[PDB]
Amino acid sequence: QNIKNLDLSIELDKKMYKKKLKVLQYEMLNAQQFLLKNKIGLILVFEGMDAAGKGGAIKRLIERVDPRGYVVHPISAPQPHELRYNYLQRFWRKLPQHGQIAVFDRSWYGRVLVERIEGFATKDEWSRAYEEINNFEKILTAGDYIIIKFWLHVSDEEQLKRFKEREQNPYDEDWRNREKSPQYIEAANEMFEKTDKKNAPWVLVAGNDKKYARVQVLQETLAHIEREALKRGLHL
Amino acid sequence: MTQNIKNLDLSIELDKKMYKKKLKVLQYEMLNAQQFLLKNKIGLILVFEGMDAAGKGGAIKRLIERVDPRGYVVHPISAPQPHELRYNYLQRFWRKLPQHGQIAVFDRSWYGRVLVERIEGFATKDEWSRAYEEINNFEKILTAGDYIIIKFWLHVSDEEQLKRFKEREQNPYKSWKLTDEDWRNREKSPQYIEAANEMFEKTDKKNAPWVLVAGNDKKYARVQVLQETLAHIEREALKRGLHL
Amino acid sequence: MTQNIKNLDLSIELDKKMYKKKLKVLQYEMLNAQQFLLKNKIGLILVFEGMDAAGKGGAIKRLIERVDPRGYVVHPISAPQPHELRYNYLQRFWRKLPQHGQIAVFDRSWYGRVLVERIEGFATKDEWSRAYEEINNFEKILTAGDYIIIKFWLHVSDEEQLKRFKEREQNPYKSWKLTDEDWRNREKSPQYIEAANEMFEKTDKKNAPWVLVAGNDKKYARVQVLQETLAHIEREALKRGLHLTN
Amino acid sequence: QNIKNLDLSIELDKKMYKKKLKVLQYEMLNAQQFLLKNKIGLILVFEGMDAAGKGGAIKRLIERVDPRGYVVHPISAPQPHELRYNYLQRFWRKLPQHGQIAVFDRSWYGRVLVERIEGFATKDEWSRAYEEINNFEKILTAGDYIIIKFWLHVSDEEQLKRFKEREQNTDEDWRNREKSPQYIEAANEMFEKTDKKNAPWVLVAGNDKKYARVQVLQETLAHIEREALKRGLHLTN
Numbered sequence A: 001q002n003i004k005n006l007d008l009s010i011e012l013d014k015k016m017y018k019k020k021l022k023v024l025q026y027e028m029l030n031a032q033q034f035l036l037k038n039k040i041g042l043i044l045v046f047e048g049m050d051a052a053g054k055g056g057a058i059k060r061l062i063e064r065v066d067p068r069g070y071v072v073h074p075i076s077a078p079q080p081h082e083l084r085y086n087y088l089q090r091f092w093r094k095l096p097q098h099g100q101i102a103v104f105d106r107s108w109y110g111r112v113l114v115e116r117i118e119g120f121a122t123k124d125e126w127s128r129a130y131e132e133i134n135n136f137e138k139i140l141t142a143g144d145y146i147i148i149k150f151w152l153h154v155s156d157e158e159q160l161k162r163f164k165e166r167e168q169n170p171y172d173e174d175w176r177n178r179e180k181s182p183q184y185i186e187a188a189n190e191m192f193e194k195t196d197k198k199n200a201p202w203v204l205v206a207g208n209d210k211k212y213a214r215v216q217v218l219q220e221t222l223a224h225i226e227r228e229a230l231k232r233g234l235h236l
Numbered sequence B: 001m002t003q004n005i006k007n008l009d010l011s012i013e014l015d016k017k018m019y020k021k022k023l024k025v026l027q028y029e030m031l032n033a034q035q036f037l038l039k040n041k042i043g044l045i046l047v048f049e050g051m052d053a054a055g056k057g058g059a060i061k062r063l064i065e066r067v068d069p070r071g072y073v074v075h076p077i078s079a080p081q082p083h084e085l086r087y088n089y090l091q092r093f094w095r096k097l098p099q100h101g102q103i104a105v106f107d108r109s110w111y112g113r114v115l116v117e118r119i120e121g122f123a124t125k126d127e128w129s130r131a132y133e134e135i136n137n138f139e140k141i142l143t144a145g146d147y148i149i150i151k152f153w154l155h156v157s158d159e160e161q162l163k164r165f166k167e168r169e170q171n172p173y174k175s176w177k178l179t180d181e182d183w184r185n186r187e188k189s190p191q192y193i194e195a196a197n198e199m200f201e202k203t204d205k206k207n208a209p210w211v212l213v214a215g216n217d218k219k220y221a222r223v224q225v226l227q228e229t230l231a232h233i234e235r236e237a238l239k240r241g242l243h244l
Numbered sequence C: 001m002t003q004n005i006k007n008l009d010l011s012i013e014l015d016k017k018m019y020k021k022k023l024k025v026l027q028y029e030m031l032n033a034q035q036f037l038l039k040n041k042i043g044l045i046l047v048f049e050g051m052d053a054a055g056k057g058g059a060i061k062r063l064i065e066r067v068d069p070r071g072y073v074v075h076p077i078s079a080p081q082p083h084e085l086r087y088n089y090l091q092r093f094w095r096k097l098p099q100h101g102q103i104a105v106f107d108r109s110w111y112g113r114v115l116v117e118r119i120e121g122f123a124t125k126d127e128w129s130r131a132y133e134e135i136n137n138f139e140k141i142l143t144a145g146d147y148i149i150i151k152f153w154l155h156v157s158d159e160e161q162l163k164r165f166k167e168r169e170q171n172p173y174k175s176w177k178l179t180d181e182d183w184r185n186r187e188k189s190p191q192y193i194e195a196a197n198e199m200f201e202k203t204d205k206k207n208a209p210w211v212l213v214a215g216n217d218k219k220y221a222r223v224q225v226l227q228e229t230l231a232h233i234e235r236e237a238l239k240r241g242l243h244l245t246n
Numbered sequence D: 001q002n003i004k005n006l007d008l009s010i011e012l013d014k015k016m017y018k019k020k021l022k023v024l025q026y027e028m029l030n031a032q033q034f035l036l037k038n039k040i041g042l043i044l045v046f047e048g049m050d051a052a053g054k055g056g057a058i059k060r061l062i063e064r065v066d067p068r069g070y071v072v073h074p075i076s077a078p079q080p081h082e083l084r085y086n087y088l089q090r091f092w093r094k095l096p097q098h099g100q101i102a103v104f105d106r107s108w109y110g111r112v113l114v115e116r117i118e119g120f121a122t123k124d125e126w127s128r129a130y131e132e133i134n135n136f137e138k139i140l141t142a143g144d145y146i147i148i149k150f151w152l153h154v155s156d157e158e159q160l161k162r163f164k165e166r167e168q169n170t171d172e173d174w175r176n177r178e179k180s181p182q183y184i185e186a187a188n189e190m191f192e193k194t195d196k197k198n199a200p201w202v203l204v205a206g207n208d209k210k211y212a213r214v215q216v217l218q219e220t221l222a223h224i225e226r227e228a229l230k231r232g233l234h235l236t237n
Helices: A017-038 A054-062 A089-093 A108-112 A123-142 A156-168 A173-178 A181-195 A210-231 B019-039 B056-064 B091-095 B110-114 B125-144 B158-169 B180-186 B189-203 B218-239 C019-039 C056-063 C091-095 C110-114 C125-143 C158-169 C180-187 C189-203 C218-239 D017-037 D054-061 D089-093 D108-112 D123-142 D156-167 D171-178 D180-194 D209-230
Strands: A041-048 A070-074 A101-105 A145-153 A202-206 B043-050 B072-076 B103-107 B147-155 B210-214 C043-050 C072-076 C103-107 C147-155 C210-214 D041-048 D070-074 D101-105 D145-153 D201-205
Touching: A017 A054, A017 A210, A041 A054, A054 A070, A054 A101, A054 A145, A054 A210, A089 B091, A108 A123, A108 A181, A123 A145, A123 A181, A123 B125, A145 A181, A145 A210, A156 A173, A173 A181, A181 A202, A202 A210, B019 B043, B019 B056, B019 B218, B043 B056, B056 B072, B056 B103, B056 B147, B056 B218, B110 B125, B110 B189, B125 B147, B125 B189, B147 B189, B147 B218, B158 B180, B180 B189, B189 B210, B210 B218, C019 C056, C019 C218, C043 C056, C056 C103, C056 C147, C056 C218, C091 D089, C110 C125, C110 C189, C125 C147, C125 C189, C125 D123, C147 C189, C147 C218, C158 C180, C180 C189, C189 C210, C210 C218, D017 D041, D017 D054, D017 D209, D041 D054, D054 D101, D054 D145, D054 D209, D108 D123, D108 D180, D123 D145, D123 D180, D145 D180, D145 D209, D156 D171, D171 D180, D180 D201, D201 D209
Parallel strands: A041 A101, A041 A145, A070 A101, A145 A202, B043 B103, B043 B147, B072 B103, B147 B210, C043 C103, C043 C147, C072 C103, C147 C210, D041 D101, D041 D145, D070 D101, D145 D201
Antiparallel strands: none
């Protein structure tokens, strides 16, 4: 079982980042062509602390991928029109077709994160959601979908630095939520305990160094895809 | 065993002239149930499967006759087409789910995965074999929230089914849309019975029950669909602390 | 070939209990029309607008009573909510369009853009004033293909409307629903008459006609909706080189 | 009126491409933030000859734009499930929300291009489609949408070269190459009838991919900025 206490947030990567980044981004383009020809859809989930580096990691991963074959979804907490359905319906509507890629910047795991800590979901709802989500991902992965989920983590000091830099780049609740970091760590740990499956693994990425985090996201995506290619008897 | 099987269904049961009274009463009760579900924002999902010409359409129509049509959709489900095969086989049904408080009726449904798709080989052995648990999990996530689900299997004898095939080709309203495949599948009825019984064994749950309806007498079948729907709605409401 | 106006409608017209005979006959003709539309893969779009409690729901229910529900959807349309305001105001209706061969009924519809949205200010002056032509173009794109469209405005007198408001507050199934909007709209009825008349002047087209229904007598209104629907389907079939046959 | 016969396919751009490209891509990022802040959607249409460079131009335009705010749709001819509706229905389903970006690699103009030439659409259908499409774009642009359409054109020899380079890394592409004169006629008629001030056509000579990409960027940004001015808004920094 994975827990945030096991991640070394001091891990760093130098300027060999340019080399590995180029190699891995072209490898990601190759993976896209493999997925398209074999009609296997790909689902990438990104969770983590605010400003942990989810957007930059996503962009580095899809930089060399053909945009005609992906959609990156920014997910917020359910709004009234979304609350007219079961909480997974919005995600079934956004599923990639076989062979396509869907990226979820935050995802259905909001059910056991912000909705749990803020009380949008009752104790019964979030407590049963682990098994419900395992079932959702299992129905998908028993067919022609691959699922992998990343949790990007940063220290409170690195997060504060990035908060300070973001308000100066003009391109609230977040400062309040920074105060609830221990609760989010506990909720994420329970999430790792109950939904880290061989068919849909969790990868914990220490994100203080953005370059290391981006390369790790790439490495884990490609390794998981490669394992699935081997398990299906296909050539990558 | 208390597993349901079609061989235990008494296809000789019938109903008389008390049909008009019971029918009008139960249809107005169904209107009442619709208003209750709307006020409490609980969606209702009714599944209809069975033999060809067993009476699904007539049962559905009698069930919704006094219900406000602004609050229901009846979906005629066929086998997955190429555009549907681009997704997991449950995606189309997640797209067709009612909003909380609305009613969705499925004339055939996701159980095609373990019925026609099994028998015709559209699904592989692994797919339909694992589909039972997948379907249980799907229905369980819905009913743990704000949906009520009940499923009906309408059955008729081979002789009654033949009589109804013949009556449909003589009806001007129906004779335009009757395929030879129904005549083809009459020969595969034993395989459908085995597949249906395994379905009943594995997916008849308290939160999503199967009701086996003897349909040779249409009046009996329609009254049973109404009664069982209303009784299940009341039981599930009670489990939520609500009273009709 | 004439401008319709609400002031030309005789709200005194009535129909006797000869309602049962014509009603059953017309409902079966509507089933036959459903079969014709499905066989020729022509979709049908029925719009209902009018005063609150003018009888839209009851008219819709009698129209589809003997129609197979696997081939229709009745949409209750309300004013756009935030999630709908993320798109052009017609996007939600394109998402609700019936497939070729199917029937879609709209209890209120896109004409809200020139009715409640105009009167309540949800739409700006420029928005509702340009909506007439926008809507004609929308309906023309649909009817030039394999769709038939017809639109009904149900009208009642203010006294009959008040009587029906009060009788619904005692309807065990109707009462529980909220009705504040209904009293708001009743207070603005003169403006609705003006707005609907401008609508009739600008969007009553041969490929998508407006039918003005005197609704004080519910039986008369139901028979008129059925008769006008079937007559329009017959004419449109003839224009397509097809024959609608009993 | 625009016609492909007036397009100079010899146009070129040299190594000043890298710097201009970087600047224009960052300007497109700024444009995305403006579009998002003001809740104005952007619709980019790409049509042209097979292998004219539409995909690469799209890729350079969105390279530095946040992918949480765009979708690029690869559009093919209507299939049976799409033929259950009016031909514009699929595209209304694909409209971006206010503030979002939607790119169409081929689009509703198939109605008057491939569908006209291959006979998927009858004479009546494709002949009335120009006005239908103008009305569609007009309802969108009178609200909170901006639309611009690009036609990418290449020479027959450059097209053959690119066909050979792709086959060394479908049949329909060779099918359309043989009917290229008819496609030129259809595109000219399209330009004549649907080049509107609110939804302009931009004809891009694509023999030099670098020039074509910079032109798509420049014309997109110029149209967005003009539209900002028309709405009383300032696209600056």
